[PDB]
Amino acid sequence: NPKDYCYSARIRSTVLQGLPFGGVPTVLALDFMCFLALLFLFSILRKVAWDYGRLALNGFCSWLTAIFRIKDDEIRDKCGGDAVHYLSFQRHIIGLLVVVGVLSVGIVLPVNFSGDLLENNAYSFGRTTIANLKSGNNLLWLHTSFAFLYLLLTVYSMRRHTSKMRYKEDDLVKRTLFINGISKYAESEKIKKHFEEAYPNCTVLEARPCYNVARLMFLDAERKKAERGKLYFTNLQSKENVPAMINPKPCGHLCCCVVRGCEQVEAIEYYTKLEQRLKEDYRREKEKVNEKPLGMAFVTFHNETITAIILKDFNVCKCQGCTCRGEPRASSCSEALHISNWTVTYAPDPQNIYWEHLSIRGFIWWLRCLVINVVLFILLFFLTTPAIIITTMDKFNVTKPVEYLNNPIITQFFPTLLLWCFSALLPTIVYYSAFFEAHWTRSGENRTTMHKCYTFLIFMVLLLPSLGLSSLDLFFRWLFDKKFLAEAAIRFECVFLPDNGAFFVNYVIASAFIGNAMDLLRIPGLLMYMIRLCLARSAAERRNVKRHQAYEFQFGAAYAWMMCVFTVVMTYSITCPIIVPFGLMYMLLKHLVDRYNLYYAYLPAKLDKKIHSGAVNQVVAAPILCLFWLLFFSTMRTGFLAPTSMFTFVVLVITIVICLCHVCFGHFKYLSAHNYKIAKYIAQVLQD
Ligand SMILES: CC(C)CCC[C@@H](C)[C@H]1CC[C@H]2[C@@H]3CC=C4C[C@@H](OC(=O)CCC(=O)O)CC[C@]4(C)[C@H]3CC[C@]12C
Ligand SMILES: CC(C)CCC[C@@H](C)[C@H]1CC[C@H]2[C@@H]3CC=C4C[C@@H](OC(=O)CCC(=O)O)CC[C@]4(C)[C@H]3CC[C@]12C
Ligand SMILES: CC(C)CCC[C@@H](C)[C@H]1CC[C@H]2[C@@H]3CC=C4C[C@@H](OC(=O)CCC(=O)O)CC[C@]4(C)[C@H]3CC[C@]12C
Ligand SMILES: CC(C)CCC[C@@H](C)[C@H]1CC[C@H]2[C@@H]3CC=C4C[C@@H](OC(=O)CCC(=O)O)CC[C@]4(C)[C@H]3CC[C@]12C
Ligand SMILES: CC(C)CCC[C@@H](C)[C@H]1CC[C@H]2[C@@H]3CC=C4C[C@@H](OC(=O)CCC(=O)O)CC[C@]4(C)[C@H]3CC[C@]12C
Ligand SMILES: CC(C)CCC[C@@H](C)[C@H]1CC[C@H]2[C@@H]3CC=C4C[C@@H](OC(=O)CCC(=O)O)CC[C@]4(C)[C@H]3CC[C@]12C
Numbered sequence: 001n002p003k004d005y006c007y008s009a010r011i012r013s014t015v016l017q018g019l020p021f022g023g024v025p026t027v028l029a030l031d032f033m034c035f036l037a038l039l040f041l042f043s044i045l046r047k048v049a050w051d052y053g054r055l056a057l058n059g060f061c062s063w064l065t066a067i068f069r070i071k072d073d074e075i076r077d078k079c080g081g082d083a084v085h086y087l088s089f090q091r092h093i094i095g096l097l098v099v100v101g102v103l104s105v106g107i108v109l110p111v112n113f114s115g116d117l118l119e120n121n122a123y124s125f126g127r128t129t130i131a132n133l134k135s136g137n138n139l140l141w142l143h144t145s146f147a148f149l150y151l152l153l154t155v156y157s158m159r160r161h162t163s164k165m166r167y168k169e170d171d172l173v174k175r176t177l178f179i180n181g182i183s184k185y186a187e188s189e190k191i192k193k194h195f196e197e198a199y200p201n202c203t204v205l206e207a208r209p210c211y212n213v214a215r216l217m218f219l220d221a222e223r224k225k226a227e228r229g230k231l232y233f234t235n236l237q238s239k240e241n242v243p244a245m246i247n248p249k250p251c252g253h254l255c256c257c258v259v260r261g262c263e264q265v266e267a268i269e270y271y272t273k274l275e276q277r278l279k280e281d282y283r284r285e286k287e288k289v290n291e292k293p294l295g296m297a298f299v300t301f302h303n304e305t306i307t308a309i310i311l312k313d314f315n316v317c318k319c320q321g322c323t324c325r326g327e328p329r330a331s332s333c334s335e336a337l338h339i340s341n342w343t344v345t346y347a348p349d350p351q352n353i354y355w356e357h358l359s360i361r362g363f364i365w366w367l368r369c370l371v372i373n374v375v376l377f378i379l380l381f382f383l384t385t386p387a388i389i390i391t392t393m394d395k396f397n398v399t400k401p402v403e404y405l406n407n408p409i410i411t412q413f414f415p416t417l418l419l420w421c422f423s424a425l426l427p428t429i430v431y432y433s434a435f436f437e438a439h440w441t442r443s444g445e446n447r448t449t450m451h452k453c454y455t456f457l458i459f460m461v462l463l464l465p466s467l468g469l470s471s472l473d474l475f476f477r478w479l480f481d482k483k484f485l486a487e488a489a490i491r492f493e494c495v496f497l498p499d500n501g502a503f504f505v506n507y508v509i510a511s512a513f514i515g516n517a518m519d520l521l522r523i524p525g526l527l528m529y530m531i532r533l534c535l536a537r538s539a540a541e542r543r544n545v546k547r548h549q550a551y552e553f554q555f556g557a558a559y560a561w562m563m564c565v566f567t568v569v570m571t572y573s574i575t576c577p578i579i580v581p582f583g584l585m586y587m588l589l590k591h592l593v594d595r596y597n598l599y600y601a602y603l604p605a606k607l608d609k610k611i612h613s614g615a616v617n618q619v620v621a622a623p624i625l626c627l628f629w630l631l632f633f634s635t636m637r638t639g640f641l642a643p644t645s646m647f648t649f650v651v652l653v654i655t656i657v658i659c660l661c662h663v664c665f666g667h668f669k670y671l672s673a674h675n676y677k678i679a680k681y682i683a684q685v686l687q688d
């Protein structure tokens, strides 16, 4: 009976996934052999293939021995506070999946193995899962009880973490306010004079307005390319005593024969005239920029306390005839400066700001972000999961190129190869959208990346293929429907099949071994780096590429993938106990790989605490989803009104409600996952 739908949302098993114990004994061995293969490969590719694994700084395995020798203090001196707090998050989850580890394997698994309901059946893996319990047993009360305890340990884990965190930001930031919405013709003097009149112990050290710096930074970078060329070809020619030539058009290497070619243009003359031209237009822009004030300012005060009391004075809220609202105070200049409109906030760190993107404000930023997210959301609505893509392909017969050869290896392999393809592609199409919204700050870009990327992964990886729905259209269709309340059991009975548990254990094994080896190899990065290197039109530009290619570490993506595997592991934790040790093994190997990547591979970022403290929210999201997975199980077997179905519902109603109060204000303390202890603001090139 449960066949024509429960295996609809993933393409189906190869060689039954291996005969014994749901394939786990087979898949674990093969993925482990791929681990040994890909790390042997990385040991060569790291050291040989144009330094790509080594840029942001040895015997054959001194890479590996370095992972085990690195100190936390030495991460701090190399990578700054964001790396330390990121590694502190992981270390709490490695502990949480050891208490959950020992309680799931120690007590939930032997209680399952006791049961009758799947005893005779062939599927030996299935016995370890909740489906093996008889319905009329208080043993379901123990499963309800642990699903509750795992919420409290997850809350206690993050209350511990957050109290240790004690994030540090430089004193220049603590005294600087970002004032947004000021009059466009507010010269520095009047911004200074407003506060230095209006507040008692006031003194303003700086008041720096913003300007439309976009093209001025473009020209600075181009000018730098010109200089790097001129200097290198000079230094080369002084030693070689022979000149060099480059084609002025793009992709100059491809000019292999003279047909409108003109490859013979001399390097020194080229870089000279180029540098002079760029210097000339750079001046023209710099003089023009002062006629484009963006109508914002950063103001830096002498005193941290007065910064606070201004910031409060503009955020106060009290009664007037229309509404409760704020009332910022009068002065000599309050009208000319339009103090009616000011939004006041602590400024980001000046390396956290995108001085380009400050240009894009008001109606147009929202119109542009809306367009990107509406077009994206429609695409994710109808193509949410790889299975609906492959199924729609088959319904339009586009498998046709395979049957040119029609080899029996290829026709059976090709579907799995395309699932790998779309599974890697669809979260990437989400992740890259954040790079076109033009967030004003690297915090904003990374927060947006976490919440979008994670949310999509929870539907692509966990929810949709669990209930056996291929797409968000199909999910809302089933939810709105006509008779949901009278038939939802047919989809809940689909979540707790042995086959479905076995699939999720296998997802985590592939994620532990192959997944992490790919995070070490970074082959898309390597491929883009080699193609960019090869297309560079000159020797000077090749060296330029090698220095530039090391990025800042993508904390938002790194969290989004991490809490996703945690969410799979801790939803399937009570219902399918065997999954948790592979969840732990994923976290050890991820933690070793990230210590390498942060220190050796990536450059340091600098991001506001909003990201690190934001990722704490999704750690609470994991055990919340696990109580749903028992409200489903309990409600379809015992009924809704039976005790285990009410208990794990009233708990959940309290948990949803207290979260949505937190969404109005993070002012709760005792019932809260967060426990806490109490010249540079000029655009990078406008100065030059
Ligand atoms: C369901 C029944 C079987 C009860 C299960 C009880 C557990 C949930 C308790 C028992 C002992 C507890 C642990 C006792 C000690 C610690 C060390 C503590 O970490 C420390 O390093 C403490 C000292 C320090 O902060 O320096 C963190 C909590 C933890 C893991 C506790 C977590 C909760 C545990 C596992
Ligand atoms: C977080 C970490 C520290 C926990 C480590 C726990 C392991 C010691 C546990 C996890 C899963 C357990 C295994 C789960 C399943 C089985 C199969 C079981 O045999 C059967 O299911 C077949 C019985 C039959 O049909 O004849 C024998 C024990 C064994 C290997 C268990 C042995 C102990 C294991 C490896
Ligand atoms: C790291 C620590 C916390 C692990 C400790 C966990 C053990 C208490 C559990 C883990 C796996 C369990 C085993 C999983 C499955 C089986 C098979 C099953 O064998 C039978 O006696 C029934 C065989 C049959 O009649 O078919 C029940 C006992 C046993 C060995 C279980 C005994 C208890 C074990 C060893
Ligand atoms: C941190 C907190 C939440 C941990 C403490 C959890 C307890 C309140 C749970 C865990 C195990 C549960 C017990 C597991 C087994 C049973 C046997 C059960 O009786 C049967 O199953 C009878 C079977 C038969 O005779 O056929 C009665 C409830 C009871 C005592 C349960 C009552 C609630 C217990 C003690
Ligand atoms: C590093 C930390 C996280 C602990 C990692 C523990 C693994 C090494 C354990 C966890 C589950 C174990 C497996 C659980 C079940 C089985 C099936 C079992 O199969 C049979 O005996 C065949 C017949 C059958 O039971 O169906 C043999 C052991 C094996 C592969 C176990 C091998 C050792 C595994 C992979
Ligand atoms: C049908 C049952 C299984 C419920 C399914 C609901 C899902 C759609 C929920 C479960 C967890 C939710 C996520 C849990 C936590 C967050 C973080 C949240 O962002 C914040 O933490 C808000 C504050 C901030 O960071 O600025 C944004 C929504 C999101 C992604 C939620 C989006 C909706 C999710 C995926």
Ligand SMILES: CC(C)CCC[C@@H](C)[C@H]1CC[C@H]2[C@@H]3CC=C4C[C@@H](OC(=O)CCC(=O)O)CC[C@]4(C)[C@H]3CC[C@]12C
Pocket (backbone or CB within 6 Å): 663
């Ligand atoms: C059945 C499934 C598909 C769930 C359907 C309901 C969702 C459409 C709702 C449930 C909870 C909602 C979320 C609850 C809390 C937040 C945090 C909120 O974050 C903010 O930036 C404002 C709060 C703050 O950070 O101060 C933005 C809206 C969001 C993501 C909400 C977006 C819409 C969500 C995911």
